[PDB]
Write a structure and sequence with these properties.
Chain A: One of its GO terms (cellular component) is mitochondrion. Chain A: Disulfide bonds join 77-106, 87-96. Chain F: It comes from Trypanosoma brucei brucei (strain 927/4 GUTat10.1). The structure is cut from a larger assembly and holds 1 copy of chain A (196 residues), 1 copy of chain B (81 residues), 2 copies of chain C, 1 copy of chain D (184 residues), 1 copy of chain F (49 residues) and 1 copy of chain G (293 residues). With 81 residues, chain B is mainly alpha-helical. Helices cover 69% and strands 0% of the residues of chain B. Chain B contains 4 helices and no strands. In chain B, helix 3 crosses helix 4 (57-80). Chain D is built from 5 helices and 1 strand; from the N terminus they run βααααα. The two termini of chain D are 29 Å apart. Strand 1 (37-38) of chain D pairs antiparallel with strand 5 (269-274) of chain G, so a sheet runs across the interface. The structure holds magnesium ion (MG) (3 copies).
Chain lengths: 196, 81, 54, 184, 53, 49, 293
């Protein structure tokens, strides 16, 4: 037909029972929204909700990648400017436009280099959106509680070592001087928790 | 997709092809011409041939390669003549 | 090792006394060569730049 | 009261306060010295320093030190922070590999292009454009060109930047290198 | 569904089939533009690096 | 009257797997090199340069 | 406009938007074009005169050189030649760097049967297979690559140790004789004014207070040094420098500026070793509880 299968006349087409009860979700998300902008839940580009996602957390650092506009950013010509600065600081009797020419030659190239990189990076944003991004569909991996199951696995281990007993228990912290301030008969080092 | 090539074969024809690019390119320069026999295969065939006559690895390789090169020598001699 | 070495006085409680000597053993990777496997995003874009300008 | 060396109040200056340890030559810091740099002759110590400081900052050591040496944090919050850090790292790596796997494709398209240039102008021509000495004639021209390449390749020393430390009010993080809000 | 490396939805490549360079360049090929051509040789089957630990 | 080199110098980018310099094709060839005897796009274009 | 900020310049429609492109800038001087064209052509002809490929070449006159190549000497040659260059080149284009190194090595090198052991002999040598792969250098080995104290400071009975400590809200500096005798008192960012009842705490421990403090301390440090040396009989009259070991506590901001204020004294103070002592907390006594934890 004339347009998408997952979007009908009035908005997104409501498959699960969540959409029949809560049909705001059919047509609304964010400020950036249009009627053709449903079913693509990502909006245009440079636009509100355009950001591609990677394992659910959106990608807002793209420029930072290609080393345009970053604190760590890629630097084209250094030897130039340091050479010219050196000259400028040495003495005022002789003057060097011999260096300034080398240098501004360098910059003159740098311009087209940058337009190139920016271009290629926009191509990356597109490729990424097609073949990698899940469009904010999958659960975050980037915060420790999202890995809770993993941590649990190790708590379990420390428990079975303890005769299957103290879960999530840890050794009591002692003192800075713990070992050397304590008389005989008292524990000088922190024990396993089951061994209290 | 699974390589029909067993890793030994891989090592062999890959090594053959790194010793000479002409042997590698021959059948397929641009697209694969697949109804013509190719040097890489012919040479692998007579490699195994040598091996089962008890010629060792290195010598068999340089020998097969010499075969291809002397054939090529004939050809380009005719070309010049 | 570091623990024993320290309590015997054969290694300092802070710092690396062999830091320079040890640089041979470390794979110092020159910005001029390219290794296809890096988590360095800078080096990649650097060689991209180099070849495009070429 | 007795403070550690990385403590806030550590080296005090007051009428009562006095500094602890043999303070010169062979010193209190004798084997406690984290870094040693012999200054090369005719080298400003500002390069020396900015190299040291860049080093510590990029390897996140000055991070750690600032962090632990200011205030106390329970082993749980410390865990939460180090693991959060490490997991965000994991994520961003898995991003970089994607970027890079694309960029090697970009570079491939560039090199491919360069090949097409080759068979438009012929290989040798392309080579000429690339700085080939075919006018080289005698060795003296080669030596001028290579004296050019020599004077290029020899590296000027890097001034590399170290982000300043931001002092906020009650100092929720003394790791603060930027004004962005953090999750403690 | 995810790739292991960076979580891609596809297996990476540049080229796959033997003919694609030919078939793409076809009128050039009949023309005979492609005879000494080194771009259709060098990179024809070229595939990505293994970026892997 | 009053009135070049790259931004970097690197070695050669690695060779992608499946990629090779085509056979009988001299990569390093200059204009002070000798003229090859035949007529190829390559030989004719170097000649013409 | 009204109680709000004026927009940035580019937020307005173009100032010259109504003036046609031909006008900005005007191209005038069209009169001179023709003149300078004829001029340049006449010039060219002169440059042709200063200095002063369709020589018909028949293919039948060449035949001898063709028969030269049909002899299998020359084809033995071409075969050898072509088998050399078939070896899988990694170059792909003329590269400036690699050329440079190559010819660099040509300048460096212009400046510069016993029975084969079988596989069985190496089967009986366990050691050999561990020699082939080993990292460890075999030959007399350099001693300076072993000894502990190799890269480390080397002091002198006369050296002054300058301590620059950068703290969060403060920075200070001192000096000490090698035998640990204190020279002048500790100049501090709150000792020198520079601190309280002022611009703020945020800038208190800043870069230039560290600078102020160090440049103020060195200034006073010189004369008392000449005194302490005048006492023991070391005149240190002229053309002399003070050998300095700069020890730095830090990672705070006041560090940078501090050392800079030393660098400008390079005509007086000679810095032999720059080594920082910054405490690292493995674990220890509780630090003061901050706001959140
Ligand atoms: Mg939103
Ligand atoms: Mg008390
Ligand atoms: Mg509470």
């Amino acid at each position: 037909r004339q347009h998408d299968s997952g979007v009908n006349q009035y908005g997104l087409k409501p498959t699960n029972a969540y959409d029949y009860i809560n049909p705001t979700n059919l047509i609304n998300f964010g400020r950036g929204t249009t009627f053709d902008n449903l079913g693509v839940r990502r909006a245009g580009r440079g636009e509100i909700d355009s950001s591609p996602s990677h394992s659910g957390s959106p990608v807002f650092t793209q420029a930072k990648l290609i080393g345009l506009s970053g604190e760590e950013q890629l630097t084209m010509c250094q030897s130039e400017t340091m050479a010219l600065r050196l000259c400028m600081a040495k003495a005022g009797k002789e003057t060097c436009e011999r260096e300034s020419r080398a240098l501004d030659s360098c910059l003159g190239r740098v311009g087209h280099l940058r337009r190139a990189m920016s271009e290629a990076c926009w191509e990356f944003n597109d490729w990424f959106i097609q073949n990698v991004s899940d469009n904010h569909t999958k659960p975050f991996q980037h915060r420790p509680h999202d890995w809770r199951h993993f941590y649990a696995q190790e708590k379990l281990v420390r428990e079975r070592q303890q005769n299957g007993h103290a879960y999530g228990r840890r050794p009591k912290q002692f003192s800075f001087g713990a070992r050397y301030v304590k008389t005989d008969g008292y524990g000088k080092r922190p024990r396993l928790p089951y061994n209290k | 997709d699974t390589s029909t090539l067993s890793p030994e074969r891989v090592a062999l024809r890959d090594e053959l092809a790194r010793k000479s690019r002409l042997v590698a390119s021959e059948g397929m320069r641009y697209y694969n011409i697949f109804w013509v026999r190719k040097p890489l295969d012919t040479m692998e065939k007579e490699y195994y041939e040598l091996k089962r006559r008890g010629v060792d690895h290195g010598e068999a390789i340089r020998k097969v390669l010499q075969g291809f090169y002397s054939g090529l020598a004939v050809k380009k001699r005719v070309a010049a003549i | 090792a570091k623990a024993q070495a320290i309590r015997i006085g054969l290694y300092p409680r802070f710092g690396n006394p062999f830091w320079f000597r040890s640089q041979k053993f470390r794979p110092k990777a020159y910005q001029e060569n390219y290794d296809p496997t890096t988590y360095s995003t800078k080096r990649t874009v650097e060689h991209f730049a180099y070849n495009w300008v070429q | 009261g007795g403070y550690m060396m990385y403590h806030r109040k550590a080296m005090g200056t007051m009428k009562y306060s006095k500094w602890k340890g043999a303070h010169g030559g062979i010193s209190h810091f004798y084997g406690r010295t984290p870094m040693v740099e012999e200054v090369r002759p005719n080298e400003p110590i500002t390069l020396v320093d900015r190299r040291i400081m860049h080093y510590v900052h990029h390897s996140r050591l000055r991070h750690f030190q600032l962090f632990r040496s200011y205030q106390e944090k329970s082993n749980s919050t410390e865990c939460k922070l180090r693991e959060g850090e490490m997991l965000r790292r994991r994520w961003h790596r898995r991003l970089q590999k994607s970027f890079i796997a694309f960029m090697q494709f970009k570079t491939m398209k560039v090199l491919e292009d360069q090949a097409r240039l080759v068979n438009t102008y012929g290989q040798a021509a392309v080579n000429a454009a690339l700085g080939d000495p075919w006018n080289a004639t005698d060795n003296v021209a080669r030596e001028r060109k290579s004296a050019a390449v020599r004077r290029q390749v020899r590296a000027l020393p890097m001034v590399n930047v170290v982000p300043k430390h931001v002092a906020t009010m009650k100092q929720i993080h003394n790791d603060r290198f930027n004004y962005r809000w953090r999750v403690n | 569904r995810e790739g292991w490396l960076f979580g891609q939805q596809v297996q990476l490549h540049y080229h796959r089939f033997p003919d694609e360079q030919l078939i793409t360049n076809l009128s050039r090929w009949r023309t005979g533009e492609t005879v000494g051509d080194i771009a259709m040789q060098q990179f024809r089957n070229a595939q990505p690096f293994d970026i892997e630990d | 009257m009053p009135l070049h080199g790259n931004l970097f110098y690197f070695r050669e980018y690695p060779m992608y797997p499946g990629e090779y310099v085509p056979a009988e094709h001299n990569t390093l060839s200059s204009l002070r090199d000798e003229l090859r005897l035949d007529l190829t796009a390559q030989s004719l274009k170097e000649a013409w340069m | 406009r009204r109680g709000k900020p004026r927009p940035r310049a580019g937020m307005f429609p173009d100032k010259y938007r109504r003036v046609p492109m031909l006008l900005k800038p005007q191209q005038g001087g069209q009169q001179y074009f023709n003149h300078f064209l004829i001029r340049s052509t006449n010039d060219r002809l002169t440059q042709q005169d200063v200095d002063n490929f369709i020589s018909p070449q028949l293919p039948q006159m060449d035949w001898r050189n063709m028969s030269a190549r049909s002899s299998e000497e020359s084809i033995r040659e071409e075969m050898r030649q072509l088998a050399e260059n078939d070896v899988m080149q990694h170059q792909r284009v003329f590269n400036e760097r690699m050329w440079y190194e190559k010819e660099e090595e040509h300048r460096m090198k212009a400046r510069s049967p016993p029975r084969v052991l079988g596989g069985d002999y190496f089967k009986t040598r366990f050691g050999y297979s561990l020699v082939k792969n080993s990292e460890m250098t075999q030959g007399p080995v350099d001693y300076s690559q072993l000894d502990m104290w190799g890269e480390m400071p080397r002091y002198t009975s006369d050296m002054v140790f300058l301590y620059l400590v950068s703290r969060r809200r403060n920075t200070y500096a001192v000096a000490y004789t090698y035998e640990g005798k204190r020279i002048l008192n500790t100049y501090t960012a709150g000792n020198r004014g520079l601190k309280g009842g002022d611009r703020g705490f945020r800038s208190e421990g800043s870069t230039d207070n560290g600078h102020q403090v160090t440049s103020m301390y060195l200034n006073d440090l010189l004369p008392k040094l000449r005194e302490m040396r005048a006492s023991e009989g070391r005149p240190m009259g002229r053309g002399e420098k003070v050998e300095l070991v700069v020890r730095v506590m830090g990672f705070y901001n006041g560090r940078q500026g501090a050392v800079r204020a030393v660098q400008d004294r390079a005509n007086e103070f000679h810095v032999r070793y720059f080594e920082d002592i910054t405490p690292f907390p493995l674990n220890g006594p509780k630090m003061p509880r901050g706001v959140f934890k």
